[PDB]
Amino acid sequence: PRARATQPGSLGAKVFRLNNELPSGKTTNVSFSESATQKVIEAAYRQVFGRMVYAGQRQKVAEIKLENGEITLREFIRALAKSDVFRNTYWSSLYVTKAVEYIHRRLLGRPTYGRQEINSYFDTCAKKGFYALVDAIIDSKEYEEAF
Amino acid sequence: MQDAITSVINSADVQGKYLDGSAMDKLKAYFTTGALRVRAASTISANAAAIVKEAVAKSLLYSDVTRPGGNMYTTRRYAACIRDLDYYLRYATYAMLAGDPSILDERVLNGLKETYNSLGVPVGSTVQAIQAMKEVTAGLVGADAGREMGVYFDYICSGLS
Amino acid sequence: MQDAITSVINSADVQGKYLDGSAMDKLKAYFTTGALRVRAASTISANAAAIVKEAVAKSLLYSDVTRPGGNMYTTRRYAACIRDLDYYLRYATYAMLAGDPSILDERVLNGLKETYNSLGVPVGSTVQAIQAMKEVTAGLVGADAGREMGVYFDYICSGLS
Amino acid sequence: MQDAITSVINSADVQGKYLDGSAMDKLKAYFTTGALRVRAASTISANAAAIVKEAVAKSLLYSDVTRPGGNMYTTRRYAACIRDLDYYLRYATYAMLAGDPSILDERVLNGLKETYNSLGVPVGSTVQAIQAMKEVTAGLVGADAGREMGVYFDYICSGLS
Amino acid sequence: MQDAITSVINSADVQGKYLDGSAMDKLKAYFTTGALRVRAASTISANAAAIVKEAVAKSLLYSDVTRPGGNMYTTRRYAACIRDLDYYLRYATYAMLAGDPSILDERVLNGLKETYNSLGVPVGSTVQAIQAMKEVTAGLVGADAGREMGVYFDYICSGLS
Amino acid sequence: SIVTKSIVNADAEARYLSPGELDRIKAFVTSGESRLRIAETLTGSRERIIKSAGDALFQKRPDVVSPGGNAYGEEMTATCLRDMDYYLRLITYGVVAGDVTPIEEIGLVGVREMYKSLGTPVDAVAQAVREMKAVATGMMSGDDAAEAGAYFDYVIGAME
Amino acid sequence: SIVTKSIVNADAEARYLSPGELDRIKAFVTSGESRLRIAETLTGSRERIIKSAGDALFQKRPDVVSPGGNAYGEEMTATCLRDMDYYLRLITYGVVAGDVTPIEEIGLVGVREMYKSLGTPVDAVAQAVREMKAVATGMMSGDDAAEAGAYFDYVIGAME
Amino acid sequence: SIVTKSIVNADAEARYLSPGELDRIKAFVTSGESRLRIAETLTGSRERIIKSAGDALFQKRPDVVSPGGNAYGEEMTATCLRDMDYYLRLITYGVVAGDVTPIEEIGLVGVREMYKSLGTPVDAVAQAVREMKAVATGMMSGDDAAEAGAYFDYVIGAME
Amino acid sequence: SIVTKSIVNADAEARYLSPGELDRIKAFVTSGESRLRIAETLTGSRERIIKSAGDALFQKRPDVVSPGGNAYGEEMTATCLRDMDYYLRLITYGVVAGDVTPIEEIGLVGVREMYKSLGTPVDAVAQAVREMKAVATGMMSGDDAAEAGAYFDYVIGAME
Amino acid sequence: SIVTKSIVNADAEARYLSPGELDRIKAFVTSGESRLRIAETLTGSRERIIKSAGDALFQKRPDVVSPGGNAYGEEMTATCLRDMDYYLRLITYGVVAGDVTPIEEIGLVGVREMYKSLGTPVDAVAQAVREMKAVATGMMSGDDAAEAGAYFDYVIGAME
Amino acid sequence: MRMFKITACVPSQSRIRTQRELQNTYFTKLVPYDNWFREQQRIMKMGGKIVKVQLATGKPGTNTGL
Ligand SMILES: CCC1=C(C)/C(=C/C2=NC(=C\c3[nH]c(/C=C4\NC(=O)[C@H](C)[C@H]4CC)c(C)c3CCC(=O)O)/C(CCC(=O)O)=C2C)NC1=O
Ligand SMILES: CCC1=C(C)/C(=C/C2=NC(=C\c3[nH]c(/C=C4\NC(=O)[C@H](C)[C@H]4CC)c(C)c3CCC(=O)O)/C(CCC(=O)O)=C2C)NC1=O
Ligand SMILES: CCC1=C(C)/C(=C/C2=NC(=C\c3[nH]c(/C=C4\NC(=O)[C@H](C)[C@H]4CC)c(C)c3CCC(=O)O)/C(CCC(=O)O)=C2C)NC1=O
Ligand SMILES: CCC1=C(C)/C(=C/C2=NC(=C\c3[nH]c(/C=C4\NC(=O)[C@H](C)[C@H]4CC)c(C)c3CCC(=O)O)/C(CCC(=O)O)=C2C)NC1=O
Ligand SMILES: CCC1=C(C)/C(=C/C2=NC(=C\c3[nH]c(/C=C4\NC(=O)[C@H](C)[C@H]4CC)c(C)c3CCC(=O)O)/C(CCC(=O)O)=C2C)NC1=O
Ligand SMILES: CCC1=C(C)/C(=C/C2=NC(=C\c3[nH]c(/C=C4\NC(=O)[C@H](C)[C@H]4CC)c(C)c3CCC(=O)O)/C(CCC(=O)O)=C2C)NC1=O
Ligand SMILES: CCC1=C(C)/C(=C/C2=NC(=C\c3[nH]c(/C=C4\NC(=O)[C@H](C)[C@H]4CC)c(C)c3CCC(=O)O)/C(CCC(=O)O)=C2C)NC1=O
Ligand SMILES: CCC1=C(C)/C(=C/C2=NC(=C\c3[nH]c(/C=C4\NC(=O)[C@H](C)[C@H]4CC)c(C)c3CCC(=O)O)/C(CCC(=O)O)=C2C)NC1=O
Ligand SMILES: CCC1=C(C)/C(=C/C2=NC(=C\c3[nH]c(/C=C4\NC(=O)[C@H](C)[C@H]4CC)c(C)c3CCC(=O)O)/C(CCC(=O)O)=C2C)NC1=O
C-alpha cells in the first residue's frame, strides 16, 4: 500500500504526467511545451470519455484554463467528468449502480472492491447527486495517493 | 430515456416518414395532459417525505420486517429502505412528467431484481410498499392524476416482480 | 453572476428592506428591454461566425499581426485569436441578456489582463477588433440593441485597458 | 524547449525570413561542437554518481550542513540534497547537448528560487556544490566540454542567485 | 505534528544528545497530565454539539451577525459558522490530547487569517465565540482541563488576531 | 432569476442560448406583470397571513409552544414569527424572480444543520410554511395561487 | 425535448422539478398548438422549400455543382437535395419538440467528421440551410417565422 | 469487537498483528470477566432502568408526550420505551464486545435519517440515553460505572 | 530537431539519454550533409514547384477556382500560392530539422479551425501538398525523394 | 509517538478516535515508566554498548577496517562509531516514543541513497546494529530486552 | 463563482522520487469556493504551509447571486 503511487513499467499502461507545467510568456514558435501539453490533454480526454470526443463536444474552456496554468490536472479531469457530454453518455443512459461502477472504473482506474464502498458512493449519489459522486471519487485518498 | 414526444418522433423517424395525423393526435393528447402532469408533479414534490413515511406506516411498520430477523431491521437497513422508496417515488414522478416509462426500465428496473435477489431484499414486501405509496399519492393528487401515477407505479411493481 | 433582477434583489437585500416601488420600476425597465434583448440575442446567436470573420477582416487582417512578426502569425495563434474573439462576443451576448456586466467582470476580465501581459498579446489590436465587432453587431441587430452591445463591449475594453 | 537549431529557426521565424547563410554558419558551428558534445554526454552519463559524490565530498561534507544544525542534517534532507545535485547535473547535461540554456530556465529555475526561500535552503552552499561539481566534470570529460558544462552550471547558479 | 513526547525527542535531537533526566521529567509530566487529558477528551467528544450550540447561543445569537446585515445572516453562512466552530473545538481537543499547540499552528492557523480577511469574516465575533466556548468547556469538563483547553483556545485566538 | 440559470446552463454546456430558452426569457419578460401583482398582494397582507398561519400552526402542533419545547415564551414565539417572516419574504423574492434560486441561496442550504444547532424541529417549520401556503393561496386568485403555491410547495419540499 | 431536459436537469441535482421548470413545461404544453401549426406549415410545403432552396444555393455557390465540386452530376445533386430534405425534417422535429435535442442528437454531432470524410464543404451546407431558412420564413407569419428561424439559426450555427 | 478491529487493521496493512495489538487483545481477554459482570448488571435490572429513565425523560422533556409530540398516547409511549430498550440492549452488546462496533454497526449509522423520517427529535432521544446512563451508573460501582458510561457516552455522542 | 525531442523524452522519463538515442543524434549529425543537399535543392526550385503544383491542383480540383469557391480572383489565387509557399517552407524546415516538430509548431496545430474560419476546404489544401510532394519527389533523386516525401506525407496525413 | 499515528489514522479515515485506540493511548500512558526505565538504562551504558558492538563488528566483518575499505583509519573508525551513536540515539528515541516513527523521520528515509553516495556498505551497518541489539538485550532484563529488541529489529529490517 | 486563487506549497515528506516535480511542491492555481474547504484540507493533510489566498472573482457580503 506504499506502492500505490509506483507506476508499472512495460507490464501495464503508460502514465501521463503534466510535469513540465507549460510555462511561457513570450513563447518561441517552435516551443516544444504546448505540444506536450496537447498530448496530456489528449490523454485526459481519452481516459475520461474512453475515446476522443467529437469535435463540437470537447471543452475548450477547461483546456484553455489548463494551458494557462490556473487549474491542476485533477481539477481539469473533474471539469471533464462533470461535463454534460460525460453525464449524458455514461450517467444518464445507464442504471445508477452500473453508472457508479463505470464512473469508478473510469476515474479511479479500477473496479470497486466491495459493498461498503458502493453503499457510500451511491449514498453520495442519493442525498446529493452525480456531481457529488464525481466530487467524492476525485476526493478519495486512493485518487490522491495513486495520481 | 424518451418522453412521449421523443418516442413519437423516433417512430416517425424509424419509419422515415413525416409526422402524419396520428402522430399529431398523439402529441395533442400529450399537450392537453401536460398541465395536469405539471401540477401533479408539483404536488408530489411538495410531500415526498410524507408520502414515503405514510407508505411505511401503512405497510412495513409493526410487521415482522421491522422486527429482529427482518430485512428492514437495523437503522442502516431502515435508512436504505427509506432511500429506496424515495427513489421509487422520484422516478415515478419523472415517468409521469415524461409520459413514457422508458426512464423506469432504463434507470430503475435495469439491475434491480438481481440486486434485490443478491442482497436478500424481499420483493413482495417492497411491492406492497410501492402499492401503498401509490394509494397515498392517488389520495393526494386526485383520481386521474393518481391513475396516471399508478400506471407507472404498476410498471415498477411489474418489473420488480 | 447577477441579472438586473438579481442586482436589484441584492441591493434591496444589503440594506435590508423589502421590495419598494423604485425596485419595481427597475424591474419593469428590465422586462421592456428584455423582449428585444431576446430577439437581438437570437440574431447574434444565428450570425456569430460571420460577425467574427467580418470583425477580423475589418481590423486585423492586413496588418502586421496577421502578417509575420505579429502575435497573430502562426495558425496556432490565429486559432487562438478567433477563439478569443468568439469568447468576447459570447460573453457580451450573455451580459446583454442579463442586463448586467458582472459576468464580464467575473469570468472574462478576471485574470485576462495579466495573461495578456505575460503572453505578449497586444491590447490595442484586441480593442480595435472588439470595437469593429461592436459596430458589426450594431449594423446587424439594430440601433438600441446595438447600444446595448456597445456598453458591454466597452466594458470589456475598459477592463482590458 | 529549444536547441541551437530550434533557436535559429525560431529567430529566423519571428522576423519572417528564410534561412540565410549566417543561420547555416550557426548550424555548422552547432554540429562541429555537437560531435564532442555527444562524447562528453556519454562520459557524464557513465560517471554521474561518482561526480555527485565527489562534489559533495569536496564542499558539503565536513561543514555545518552535513553536520547537525544545517539543512543537510537528517537522512531525509541528505537524500533530497543528493537528488537535487543529480538533477542539476542531469539538466546541465541536457543543456550541453541542446546547446541552449532554455531548458535550465524552463524546467530548473522556474520556481526553484521561491521554494528554496520557503524551505530555508542555503543558496550559497548549493552554489559552492554546483561549482565543485563543475570542475569535477571539467577534470573528467576534458577542457572544451568542461567550458561547455561551465557556462551551463553558471547559468544554473545565476538563475539560483 | 508533534506531541509533548515528539517535541522532547525533537529538541534532544537538534542538539544531538541522548535522553537526559530532564527529558524524562517532561515525559512523566506529560503522562500524569495525559490520564486526565484522556477523560476530558472523552467528555468533550461526548458533548461537542451542545458545547457549540451553547457557545453560539451565548455570544453570536442575538447580535447583528445572526441578524441581517451580518456575516452570519444566510443559512449558508450560518452552516459555515457552525462548521468553523466545530473545527475550532475539534482541533483544540487534538491540541489538548497531544500537549502541544503545533497542530493549531500547522492545520488551523496556516492560511485562516488571509481567508478571513478576504471573505470579510469578523475576527472579533469569532474570538468572542471561541472564548464563550472556552468557558463552556471549562464548566463542562472541569478546572485543570479547563485551563488545558484555555491555553489552546487562547493559542487559536492569538493566531487569529 | 431564470436568466442567470439559463446563462449558467449555456456556460456549462459551452454554447450560446438556444432559441427555446430565449423564448423562455421572453415569456418570463412578458409575464413580469402577473408576478408583480402576486408579489404585490403578498407584500400587502403579510401580517394577516403570518398571524393566521402562526395560530393555525400552534393549533395543529402544540409541542413547540409547550413547556420544554422550542418556541416557549414571548420572545421565542416572536422569533418563530420572525422566521416565518423571513420565509414569506424569500417566497416573494422567488415569486418575483421566476426561479427558486434566491430562496435556495438565502434560506435553504443549511437549514437542517442550523436548526439541528438551535433545537428547532424542522418538520414544524415545514408545517408553518404549509399553513402560510394554505392561507396565501386562500387569498389569491386560483391561477396566481397556483404560481405562488409552486414556490411554497418547493420550500416545504426542501424542508422535509 | 423540454420535458426531457427539465427531467434530466432536475435528475442530476437529486431534486424534484422546481416550480419555475414546471411552469416552463406548462407554457410549452400550451404553445404546442402553435408548434404543430408551424410543423404542418413546414411539412406540407417541403417540395417548394427544397426546390427553391436548392435553386438559390446553386445560384449562390455554383462551384459545388461545377465539375470538380461534390454535388456534380445527376445522382450527386439528388443526394444533395436529399441531405437538404434530411435537415428540413430535423427542423420539423425540433419545432415540435420545443428544443434542439432532436436536431443535435440526430444530425449535428459528428456532422463535421462526416462531411470531411465525404469531401464536402460545410460552408456550402450552411448556405443551403440559409436558403432553406429564407424560403421557410418567407412562407409564414411573423412570430411563426421567428420561432422556425430559431431552429434554422441553430442548425446554421452548429455548422460553423 | 477488539479482535475484529485489530485483525482488520492489520489486514489492510498486509502485515500480521503487531505485538502491541496482541497484548491489547490479551488485556481485553483478561478484562472479559469484569465485562461480563457489567453485562449481567445491565441485563438483570433492565426493567427499572427503562422505567426510571422513561420517567425522568418525560419529566425532563414533557413536550414529546404532550399532544403534538411524537410519543403521545399509549402505543406511542410503549414504542418509545421499546426504542430505549433497544438502545440498552446495544449498550450491553458494546459492553461485552469491548468496542462500539456492535452499537455503531447496528443502531447508530442511519439513526438521523430514520428518526427524521419518523418525525422524532433526536435531542430528546439523547436525553433518553442520558437518563438511562444516570440510572445505570447509579446502579454500579465506580470503575464499572465508568466502563459502562464510556459506551453510554458513545451513544449520546453519536446522537449529536 | 531530434535533439529537443530526445531531451524532452529523457526529461519526462527523468533519466539521462540512452546510448541508442545518443547514437541517433550522432547519426543525425553525420547525415546533416544529405539533408542540407535536400533543403538546398528545394529552396532552389521553389517557384517551379509551386507553379506546376498549383496548376495541377487547379486542373484536378476546379471547385476552388470556380465562382463561389474559395480561391476566386487574382488576389485569392495569389494567397493560395502564398499558403503553398508557407507549407513548402515548413517542409524545408522539417527536412533540415530531422523532425516534424517545427512543422507542427508553426503550421499544423489549428489549421482545421482557422480554415473553418476562412472557408477554405482543407482537403483541397491536402491535394495541394500532394501535388507539391509529387513534383518535389519528381525533382529529387529517389533516396532523397523518399526522405522529403516522408515529411510531405506527414503534412498530408495531418491535413486529412 | 503512538498518539500522532493514531491521530493521522483517525484523520485519514475522517472519524474520531475509536475506544480501542483510546485504550491503546491509555495503556501507552501507563507503560511510560517501563519505557523510561529502558531508555534510562540504554542512555546509561551507551559507551560500553558501542565499544563492545564495534569490536564485535570489526571481528565479524573485517572488510570495512581493511585497506581500501570504507572505515579505514582513525577518523573513519571514529565516524563509524559516531554513526552507531546516532543509531542507538534514535533507538532510545523510538523506545521512549512507543513508535518507530521518529527513527523513520530522522534516520531511515534515505540511508540507502546516502550510503550509496559515501560508499558505505549498508549490510555492514545492519551487522553493526545487530551487534548493538545483541549487546543491549544482553544488558537488559528479558521482557525489556524484548521491547528494545523490537525497535532494534525494526532498524535492521529497514536496513537490509 | 467566488473563485479562490491559492499560492500554496506542498511538502515532500516521504517516498523520495526521481521525478522533477517542481509543479507539485510549489504552485499557484485557482479553485472554486465550494470545494475550497476540501482542497485546503488536502494541503493540511499533506503538511505544507499555504502562502497566500486571494479571491480571484466575486465579492464578500453577497447574499444572492453568489
Ligand atoms: C435507483 C435504483 C436503485 C435501487 C432501488 C437500489 C436499491 C438498493 N437497496 C439496497 C438495500 C436495502 N433495501 C432495503 C429495502 C427494503 N427491505 C425491506 O425489508 C423493505 C420491504 C424494503 C423497503 C421498502 C433494505 C432494508 C436494504 C438494506 C439491506 C442491508 O443493509 O442488509 C441496496 C444495498 C446497498 C446499499 O444499501 O446502500 C441497493 C443497491 N439501488 C439502486 O441503484
Ligand atoms: C472567457 C474569458 C476568457 C478569455 C478571453 C481567455 C483568453 C485566452 N487567450 C489566450 C491566448 C491568445 N489570445 C490571442 C489574441 C489575439 N490575437 C491577437 O493578436 C489579437 C490582439 C487578439 C485577437 C483578437 C492570441 C494571439 C493568443 C495566443 C498567444 C500564444 O500563447 O501563442 C489564452 C492562452 C491559451 C490559449 O492559447 O488560448 C487564454 C486563456 N480565456 C478565458 O477564459
Ligand atoms: C481546520 C482549520 C480550518 C478552518 C477554521 C477553516 C475555515 C473556513 N471558514 C470558511 C468560512 C466562514 N467562516 C465563517 C465564520 C463565522 N461566522 C461568523 O460570522 C463568525 C465571525 C464565525 C462563526 C464563529 C463564515 C460566516 C464563513 C462563510 C463566509 C462566506 O464565504 O460566505 C471557509 C470558506 C469555505 C466555507 O464556506 O466554509 C473556510 C475554508 N478551514 C479550515 O481548514
Ligand atoms: C432567510 C433565511 C433565514 C432563516 C431560516 C433564519 C433563522 C433564524 N431563526 C432564529 C431563531 C428561532 N427560530 C425559531 C423558530 C421556530 N421554532 C419554533 O418553535 C417554530 C416551530 C419555528 C418557527 C417556524 C425559534 C424558537 C428561535 C429562537 C431560538 C432560540 O432563541 O434558542 C435565528 C436567531 C435570531 C436572529 O439572529 O434573528 C435565526 C438567524 N434566519 C435567516 O436569515
Ligand atoms: C439526418 C442527418 C444526416 C445527414 C446530414 C446525412 C448525410 C449523408 N450525406 C451523404 C452524401 C452527400 N451529401 C451531399 C450534399 C451536399 N454536397 C454539396 O455540395 C451541398 C453543399 C450539400 C447538400 C446541399 C453530397 C454531394 C453527397 C455525396 C457525397 C459523395 O457521393 O461522395 C451520405 C452518404 C450516402 C448516403 O447514404 O446518403 C450521408 C450518410 N445522413 C444523415 O443521416
Ligand atoms: C436497535 C436500533 C433500532 C432503533 C433505535 C429502532 C427504532 C424504531 N423506532 C420506531 C418508532 C418510534 N420510536 C419512538 C421513540 C421516541 N420518540 C420520542 O419522543 C422519544 C424521544 C423516543 C424514545 C425515548 C416513537 C414515538 C416511535 C413511533 C413513531 C411513529 O409512530 O410515527 C420504529 C418504527 C416502528 C417499529 O417497527 O418499531 C423503528 C424501526 N429500530 C431499531 O432497529
Ligand atoms: C505557416 C503556417 C501558416 C498557414 C497555413 C497560413 C495560412 C493563411 N492563409 C491565408 C489566406 C488564404 N489561403 C487561401 C488558400 C486556399 N484556398 C484555396 O482556394 C486553396 C485550395 C487553398 C490553397 C492551398 C485563400 C483563398 C486565402 C484568402 C482567404 C480570404 O481572403 O478570404 C491567410 C490570410 C492572409 C495573411 O495574413 O497572409 C493566412 C494567415 N499562414 C501561416 O502562417
Ligand atoms: C541519525 C541519522 C544519521 C545517519 C545514519 C548519519 C550518517 C553519517 N555518516 C557519516 C560518515 C561515515 N559513516 C561511516 C560508517 C560506516 N562505514 C563503515 O566502515 C562502518 C561499517 C559504517 C559504520 C556502521 C564512515 C566510515 C563515515 C565517513 C565516510 C567518509 O568520510 O568518507 C556522515 C558524515 C559526517 C558528518 O557530517 O557527521 C553522516 C552525516 N547522520 C545522521 O544524522
Ligand atoms: C528539475 C529541477 C528541480 C529541482 C532542482 C527541484 C528541487 C527541490 N528540492 C527540494 C528540497 C531540498 N533541496 C535541498 C538542497 C540542498 N541540500 C543543501 O542543504 C544544499 C544547499 C543543497 C544540496 C546541494 C534540501 C536540503 C531539500 C529538502 C529540505 C526539506 O524540505 O526538508 C524540493 C522539495 C521536495 C523535496 O524534498 O525534494 C524540490 C521540489 N525540483 C525540481 O523540479
> What secondary structure does DSSP assign to chain I, as a single string?
-HHHHHHHHHHHTTSPPPHHHHHHHHHHHHTHHHHHHHHHHHHHSHHHHHHHHHHHHHHH-TTTTSTTSSS-SHHHHHHHHHHHHHHHHHHHHHHHHSSSHHHHHHHSSSHHHHHHHHT--HHHHHHHHHHHHHHHHHHS-HHHHHHHHHHHHHHHHHH-
Element (H, E) at K30: strand K29-31
Beta bridge partners, H67, equal H69
> CA Rg, chain H, in Å?
18
Contact F2, F28 (CB under 8 A): yes
Interchain touch E–J (≥3 Cβ pairs closer than 8 Å): yes
Q: Counting Cβ atoms within 10 Å, is residue B35 exposed (0-12), middle (13-18) or buried (19+)?
A: middle
Identify the sign of the CA torsion H40, H43, H48, H49. positive
Centre of ligand 6 to C-alpha H63, Å, is 17
What are D94's three cell numbers? Answer: 541536457
Q: How many angstroms separate the Cα of I111 from the Cα of each of C11, F138, I123, I124? A: 48, 65, 11, 13
Check if E75 contacts D (Cβ < 8 Å).
no
Q: How many angstroms separate the Cα of A66 from the Cα of each of A74, C93, C142? A: 10, 25, 38
Q: What torsion do the CA atoms of F91, F93, F97, F98 make, to the nearest 10 degrees?
A: 10
Q: Which residue of H has its CA nearest to J15?
A: H158
Chains that touch I (3 or more CB pairs under 8 A): A, C, D, G, K
* Residue C81 known to bind ligand: yes
Interchain touch F–B (≥3 Cβ pairs closer than 8 Å): yes
- Strand pairing report for K53-55 and K4-6: antiparallel
Residue G91 CA to its chain's centroid (Å): 3
Contact B46, F159 (CB under 8 A): no
CB-based pocket (< 6 A), ligand 9: D 65, 71-72, 77, 80-81, 84-85, 87, 91, 107-108, 112, 115, 119, 121-122, 125-126, 129; K 12, 20-22, 25
Q: Please, where are the H alpha helices in chain K?
A: 22-25, 36-46
Measure CB to CB from residue H68 to each of F61, F116, F122 and give the nearest one: F61
Picking from G6, C47, F94, J66, the residue whose alpha carbon sits closest to that of residue B96 is G6
**Sequence ranges of the binding site of F for (2R,3E)-phycocyanobilin:** 80
Identify the sign of the CA torsion J49, J53, J54, J59. positive
Picking from I138, I45, I52, the residue whose alpha carbon sits closest to that of residue I92 is I45
* Rounded Cα–Cα distance for residues E55 and B84 (Å): 38
Contact G100, F20 (CB under 8 A): yes
Output phi, psi for K4, to 5 deg.
-85, 135
Q: How many CB atoms lie within 10 A of CB G12?
A: 18
What are B151's three cell numbers? Answer: 400506471
Rounded to a whole number of angstroms, the distance between the first and last alpha carbons of chain C is 22
Centre of ligand 5 to C-alpha B7, Å, is 26
Element (H, E) at C28: helix C21-46
Beta bridge partners, K30, equal K5
Q: Which residue of E has its CA nearest to C12?
A: E69
Centre of ligand 7 to C-alpha I96, Å, is 24
Rounded to a whole number of angstroms, the distance between the first and last alpha carbons of chain K is 6
Contact G7, B97 (CB under 8 A): yes
Q: Which residues contact I59 (CB under 8 A, 6 or more apart)?
A: none
- Looking at this protein, which amino acid is placed at residue I14? A
- Kindly state the DSSP code that residue G6 receives in the 8-state scheme: H
- Kindly state the DSSP code that residue A140 receives in the 8-state scheme: S
* Rounded Cα–Cα distance for residues F159 and E84 (Å): 24
- Looking at this protein, which amino acid is placed at residue H83? D
Picking from G81, G82, G102, G124, the residue whose alpha carbon sits closest to that of residue G35 is G102
Element (H, E) at K29: strand K29-31
Helix, strand or coil for residue K11?
Answer: coil
Beta strands in chain B (DSSP E): none
Size of interface E-F (CB pairs under 8 A): 34
* Rounded Cα–Cα distance for residues I96 and D9 (Å): 10
Helix, strand or coil for residue K5?
Answer: strand
* Strand order from edge to edge, sheet including K29-31: K29-31, K4-6, K53-55
- Strand pairing report for K29-31 and K4-6: antiparallel
Give C57→chain A minimum CA distance, Å. Answer: 24
Contact J83, J125 (CB under 8 A): yes
Output phi, psi for A139, to 5 deg.
-65, -30
Residue G68 CA to its chain's centroid (Å): 28
Q: Counting Cβ atoms within 10 Å, is residue A56 exposed (0-12), middle (13-18) or buried (19+)?
A: middle
In our burial notation (b when 16+ CB lie closer than 10 A, e otherwise), range A18-39 reads: bbbbbbeeebbbbbbbbbbbee
Contact E53, F119 (CB under 8 A): yes
For every residue of B45-59, which 3-state class applies, written as one string? Answer: HHCHHHHHHHHHHHH
Output phi, psi for B87, to 5 deg.
-65, -45
Residue J99 CA to its chain's centroid (Å): 11
- Looking at this protein, which amino acid is placed at residue G50? I
For residue D72, the ligand closest to its alpha carbon is 9
Which residues of A, range 71-130, sit inside 8 Å of B by Cβ?
92-98, 119, 123, 126
* Rounded Cα–Cα distance for residues F13 and H153 (Å): 51
* Rounded Cα–Cα distance for residues F63 and G74 (Å): 85
* Rounded Cα–Cα distance for residues E111 and H126 (Å): 37
- Looking at this protein, which amino acid is placed at residue F25? I
Long-range contacts of I90-95 (CB under 8 A, 24+ apart): I90/I155, I91/I42, I91/I132, I91/I136, I91/I148, I91/I151, I91/I152, I91/I155, I92/D19, I92/I39, I92/I42, I92/I43, I93/D9, I94/I151, I94/I154, I95/I35, I95/I38, I95/I39, I95/I42, I95/I147, I95/I148, I95/I151
Contact E6, J4 (CB under 8 A): yes
Rounded to a whole number of angstroms, the distance between the first and last alpha carbons of chain G is 23
Element (H, E) at K31: strand K29-31
Output phi, psi for A82, to 5 deg.
-90, 10
What are B59's three cell numbers? Answer: 405497510
Resolution in angstroms, to 1 decimal, for this deposition?
3.5
* Rounded Cα–Cα distance for residues J136 and C143 (Å): 95
Measure CB to CB from residue F66 to each of H62, H116, H123 and give the nearest one: H62
- Match 506549497 to its residue by C-alpha cell: K9
* Rounded Cα–Cα distance for residues G87 and G100 (Å): 12
CB < 8 Å to F64, chain H: 63, 68
Q: Which atom of ligand 9 is nearest to the CA of K16?
A: 38
Residue nearest to atom 29 of ligand 4 (CA): F118
* Rounded Cα–Cα distance for residues H61 and I18 (Å): 79
Rounded to a whole number of angstroms, the distance between the first and last alpha carbons of chain I is 24
Left (φ > 0), alpha (ψ -120 to 50) or beta: where does B142 sit?
left
Task: Tell me how the structure was determined.
Answer: cryo-EM
Give K42→chain A minimum CA distance, Å. Answer: 9
Pocket test for ligand 5, best of G120, G123, G159 (most atoms within 8 A of CB): G120
* Rounded Cα–Cα distance for residues E98 and J6 (Å): 11
* Rounded Cα–Cα distance for residues C88 and C44 (Å): 12
Contact F62, F68 (CB under 8 A): no
Contact C111, C137 (CB under 8 A): no
- Match 532510545 to its residue by C-alpha cell: J92
Contact E120, E77 (CB under 8 A): no
Left (φ > 0), alpha (ψ -120 to 50) or beta: where does B74 sit?
beta
* Rounded Cα–Cα distance for residues G56 and D103 (Å): 58
* Rounded Cα–Cα distance for residues G39 and G54 (Å): 21
Residue A136 CA to its chain's centroid (Å): 13
H124 half-sphere exposure, CB direction, 13 A CA radius: 27
* Rounded Cα–Cα distance for residues D119 and D116 (Å): 5
Identify the sign of the CA torsion A25, A29, A32, A34. positive
Q: Which residue of H has its CA nearest to F62?
A: H68
What are G143's three cell numbers? Answer: 412570430
- Looking at this protein, which amino acid is placed at residue I155? V
- Match 465579492 to its residue by C-alpha cell: K59
- Looking at this protein, which amino acid is placed at residue D73? Y
Please tell me if the CB atom of residue F79 comes closer than 6 angstroms to any atom of ligand 4: yes
- Looking at this protein, which amino acid is placed at residue D40? A
What are I149's three cell numbers? Answer: 516525401
- Looking at this protein, which amino acid is placed at residue I79? T
Contact G76, G82 (CB under 8 A): no
Contact G148, G91 (CB under 8 A): yes
Picking from A26, I87, I153, the residue whose alpha carbon sits closest to that of residue C75 is I87
Residue count of chain A, please give it.
Answer: 147
Contact F55, F71 (CB under 8 A): no
Picking from D82, D100, D84, the residue whose alpha carbon sits closest to that of residue K20 is D84
Q: What torsion do the CA atoms of E61, E66, E67, E68 make, to the nearest 10 degrees?
A: 180
In our burial notation (b when 16+ CB lie closer than 10 A, e otherwise), range A97-123 reads: bebbbbbbebbbeeeeeeeeeeeebbb
B71 half-sphere exposure, CB direction, 13 A CA radius: 14
Contact K40, K50 (CB under 8 A): yes
F61 half-sphere exposure, CB direction, 13 A CA radius: 24
Q: How many CB atoms lie within 10 A of CB A4?
A: 11
Output phi, psi for J72, to 5 deg.
-115, 120
* Rounded Cα–Cα distance for residues D155 and A52 (Å): 42
Contact I57, I128 (CB under 8 A): yes
* Rounded Cα–Cα distance for residues J42 and E93 (Å): 34
- Match 554498548 to its residue by C-alpha cell: J49
Helix, strand or coil for residue K4?
Answer: strand
Picking from I135, I130, I118, the residue whose alpha carbon sits closest to that of residue I159 is I130
Determine, for residues A92 and B1 on separate chains, whether the beta-carbon distance falls below 8 Å. yes
Q: Which residue of F has its CA nearest to A80?
A: F12
> CA Rg, chain F, in Å?
18
Measure CB to CB from residue J11 to each of K14, K16, K45 and give the nearest one: K45
Please tell me if the CB atom of residue G64 comes closer than 6 angstroms to any atom of ligand 5: yes
Contact J142, J40 (CB under 8 A): no
Helix, strand or coil for residue K55?
Answer: strand
CA angle F38, F44, F50 (to 5 degrees): 100
What are C103's three cell numbers? Answer: 459576468
Contact H66, F62 (CB under 8 A): yes
CA angle I123, I124, I127 (to 5 degrees): 90
Contact G87, B3 (CB under 8 A): no
Q: How many CB atoms lie within 10 A of CB F29?
A: 20
What are D130's three cell numbers? Answer: 554546483
Beta bridge partners, K53, equal K6
Helix, strand or coil for residue A83?
Answer: coil
Q: Which residue of C has its CA nearest to D11?
A: C69
Beta bridge partners, A92, equal none
Determine, for residues H99 and J27 on separate chains, whether the beta-carbon distance falls below 8 Å. no
Measure CB to CB from residue A25 to each of C74, C76, C118 and give the nearest one: C118
Contact J42, J88 (CB under 8 A): yes
Determine, for residues K65 and F106 on separate chains, whether the beta-carbon distance falls below 8 Å. no
> CA Rg, chain G, in Å?
18
* Rounded Cα–Cα distance for residues A139 and A143 (Å): 7
Element (H, E) at H77: helix H74-97
Picking from A91, A88, A66, A90, the residue whose alpha carbon sits closest to that of residue A77 is A66
Check if A115 contacts F (Cβ < 8 Å).
no
Contact I109, A27 (CB under 8 A): no
* Rounded Cα–Cα distance for residues B124 and B121 (Å): 9
Output phi, psi for A9, to 5 deg.
-120, 120
Rounded to a whole number of angstroms, the distance between the first and last alpha carbons of chain D is 22
Q: Which residues contact H160 (CB under 8 A, 6 or more apart)?
A: E48, E49, E50, F116, H122, H123, H126
Measure CB to CB from residue B5 to each of G1, G19, G46 and give the nearest one: G1
Contact D153, D131 (CB under 8 A): yes
